[PDB]
Amino acid sequence: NPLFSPYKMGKFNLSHRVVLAPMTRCRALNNIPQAALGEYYEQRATAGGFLITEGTMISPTSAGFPHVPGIFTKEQVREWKKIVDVVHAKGAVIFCQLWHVGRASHEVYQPAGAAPISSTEKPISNRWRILMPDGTHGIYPKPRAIGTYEISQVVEDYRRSALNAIEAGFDGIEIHGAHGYLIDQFLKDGINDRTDEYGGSLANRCKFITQVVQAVVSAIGADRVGVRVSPAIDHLDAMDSNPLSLGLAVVERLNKIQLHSGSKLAYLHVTQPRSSEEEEARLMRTLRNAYQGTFICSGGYTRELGIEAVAQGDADLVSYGRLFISNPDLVMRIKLNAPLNKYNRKTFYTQDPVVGYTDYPFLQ
Ligand SMILES: Cc1cc2nc3c(=O)[nH]c(=O)nc-3n(C[C@H](O)[C@H](O)[C@H](O)COP(=O)(O)O)c2cc1C
Numbered sequence: 001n002p003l004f005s006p007y008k009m010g011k012f013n014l015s016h017r018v019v020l021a022p023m024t025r026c027r028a029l030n031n032i033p034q035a036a037l038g039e040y041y042e043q044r045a046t047a048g049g050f051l052i053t054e055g056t057m058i059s060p061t062s063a064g065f066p067h068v069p070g071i072f073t074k075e076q077v078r079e080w081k082k083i084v085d086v087v088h089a090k091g092a093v094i095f096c097q098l099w100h101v102g103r104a105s106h107e108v109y110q111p112a113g114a115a116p117i118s119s120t121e122k123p124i125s126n127r128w129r130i131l132m133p134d135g136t137h138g139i140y141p142k143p144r145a146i147g148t149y150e151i152s153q154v155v156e157d158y159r160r161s162a163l164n165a166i167e168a169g170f171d172g173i174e175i176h177g178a179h180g181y182l183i184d185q186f187l188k189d190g191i192n193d194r195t196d197e198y199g200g201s202l203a204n205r206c207k208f209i210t211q212v213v214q215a216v217v218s219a220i221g222a223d224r225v226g227v228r229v230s231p232a233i234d235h236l237d238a239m240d241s242n243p244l245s246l247g248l249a250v251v252e253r254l255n256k257i258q259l260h261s262g263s264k265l266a267y268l269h270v271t272q273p274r275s276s277e278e279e280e281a282r283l284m285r286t287l288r289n290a291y292q293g294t295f296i297c298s299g300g301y302t303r304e305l306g307i308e309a310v311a312q313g314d315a316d317l318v319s320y321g322r323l324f325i326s327n328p329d330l331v332m333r334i335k336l337n338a339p340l341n342k343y344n345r346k347t348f349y350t351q352d353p354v355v356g357y358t359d360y361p362f363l364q
Pocket residue numbers: 021022023024025054055097176178228271298299300301319320321322323348349
């Protein structure tokens with residue numbers, strides 16, 4: 001089974017290639033990591049396995065879901081340290097995903113009920129609805145398009161949060177540049193309507209992600225930085241007119257950061273849509289072949305599809321989301337080819353510290 005062939009992810013020696021994909025679960029009450037998160041990540045940690053946390057706020061304006069953790073306060077750092085320690089006690093490697101939602105937010109999630117920030121002043125359309133703290137679905141509001149000074153201060157929020165993650169003991173961080181959130185609002189030509197130096201051309205639309213990645217690389221070192229993007233996912237009205245070209249332009253920026261810094265990033269992590277199969281696969285392989293480094297694929301993977309991806313050279317690591325929700329021992333089940341247990345979508349985003357969170361059983 002090639003998923004169990006060791007892999008060197010820079011300074012990290014992994015024993016297997018099954019990765020816990022980053023998943024928002026909304027148990028971090030009041031944005032503070034809770035003991036429940038410790039039990040949840042400990043259940044899924046394995047010796048030499050790689051875990052990526054749920055998306056974590058970089059600032060008070062960065063949230064668009066209830067009860068997501070932050071890493072911008074020293075109280076948050078203290079509580080994350082307790083979670084990182086239990087994961088490292090099992091010999092796992094763990095990165096914190098740094099997440100800013102941009103326009104995918106609501107007044108209820110913003111300080112003083114201010115407008116969310118974005119590349120644009122246009123709202124996500126009413127084709128999409130935001131999950132509200134009471135469990136209802138709300139309307140995304142009009143965001144405020146930020147100036148370039150404000151862009152630079154968001155970059156400094158990523159930098160500070162990366163340093164905070166290292167302070168809590170994380171092995172590294174992942175930049176969430178996917179799924180229609182703030183970075184993708186700059187990347188995608190279906191969203192970025194700017195006429196300044198952060199809009200228009202591919203080079204301009206890639207400036208924000210390049211500056212975010214360079215800032216964290218300078219602060220913590222490239223080998224502790226992963227980058228996640230999704231050029232071919234249109235979530236929250238985030239379409240590009242040429243997804244492959246956009247992906248390749250991002251990849252060229254990452255290769256350039258590596259050459260300038262004299263080091264490689266920990267990885268590039270791409271999530272694919274599952275609409276089709278041959279075209280989606282070809283786009284993934286084209287991005288992988290363009291990138292000078294480690295490639296993590298994600299989106300709809302199963303045991304068999306992950307085996308195929310590694311065996312065919314299409315990816316170095318395979319991340320799993322929903323199967324890891326319901327199979328805390330997913331790694332062992334994959335190793336043994338044991339049947340996998342279903343997940344219950346109704347408890348993906350609830351606040352209960354146990355139910356649908358830590359009460360999915362291990363193999364008998
Ligand atoms: C409940 C849930 C929450 C998720 N939250 C995040 C997140 O915080 N950050 C992110 O980059 N992707 C997030 N994702 C996407 C997953 O990381 C992953 O790409 C997707 O689940 C992979 O597909 P799979 O579930 O078929 O394995 C989330 C997915 C789910 C189902």
